[PDB]
Amino acid sequence: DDAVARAVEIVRKQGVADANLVRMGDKSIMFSEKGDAFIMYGKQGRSWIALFDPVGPRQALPDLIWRFVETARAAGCRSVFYQISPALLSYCADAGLRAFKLGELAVVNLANFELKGGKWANLRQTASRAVRDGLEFAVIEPQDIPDVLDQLAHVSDTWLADHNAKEKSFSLGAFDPDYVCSQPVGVLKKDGKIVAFANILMTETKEEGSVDLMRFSPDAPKGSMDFLFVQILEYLKGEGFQRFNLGMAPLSDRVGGTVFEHGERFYNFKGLRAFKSKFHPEWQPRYLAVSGGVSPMIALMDATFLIGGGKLAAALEHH
């Protein structure tokens, strides 16, 4: 009785790459009546928190959203939609939810991207140095990931240790073998070993691609992150994709400050905004929507606890 595998079937058929986060298995799933759309969500504090836009055909969305919001209310909890797109603002408002800007998503139009055409000098130069340093890129399909799982784990473990970092959840994936083997990975190799990898989040519609995990061993040279992103970008472009999402960046007032702190905590694991700006991306806003007139502060703190695994040790270091 695997709700997750059923949700994956819906993911494959739509265009939102980040809906693949359902594959982590740590989110509950609520299906539409016809079974053609779903909301994946978590529970934290007195909140039910949906992750991203509801997934599936737009026609299923108003009843599905309403079911989610009413089910949370019946359980004594507020309802939250975490990191929704502009196209969901009207649907969420029609269910009584107010939206607040969370940050912006960096999106690369793959048709126009031309590494050597003149508009991306910094990335072109960095990619040259990467090749000269001996870095090679490959995409590894799921069934071929077990054979390198020891190398991926080496990269992941040393990355976490290097950054004194702990695994997150909900909106961010973690090095869980079932999840890691479920989607293709892009890897960098040097001197015969993998020194970096990212999972490549795709769908069958070839609209949008993204990455979730992205990690580097101490043997990854400087510029490895730039090169891995460019290499995955070109792979997706070559496979016919329209867009490559590089991830969220923090918001460019107690409300706005809490929003900024939340983004600083969670949006800077695979390059800062300045790194994303090297791709001259389109910046698309994303939102937190909350029921009941509650201030976005409460919902965002619940999301912070939820992504941190139910824990929050301290404020971030700031001067």
Residue numbers in the entry: 542 to 793, 805 to 871
Please share excerpts from the published article on this structure.
The crystal structure of the catalytic domain of RtMprF in the C-terminal region has been solved at 2.0 Å resolution, and serves as the initial model for building the corresponding region in the cryo-EM structures of the full-length RtMprF. The synthase domain of RtMprF (Pro539-Gly860) superposes well with those of PaMprF and BlMprF (root-mean-square deviation of α-carbons at 0.977 and 1.297 Å, respectively). They share similar tandem repeats of the General Control Nonderepressible 5 (a histone acetyltransferase of a transcriptional regulatory complex) related N-acetyltransferase (GNAT) folds (GNAT folds 1 and 2). The potential binding site of lysyl-tRNA in the synthase domain of RtMprF is located at the cleft between GNAT folds 1 and 2, according to the previous studies on an alanyl transferase FemX involved in peptidoglycan biosynthesis (in complex with an aminoacyl-tRNA analog) and BlMprF in complex with L-lysine amide (LYN).
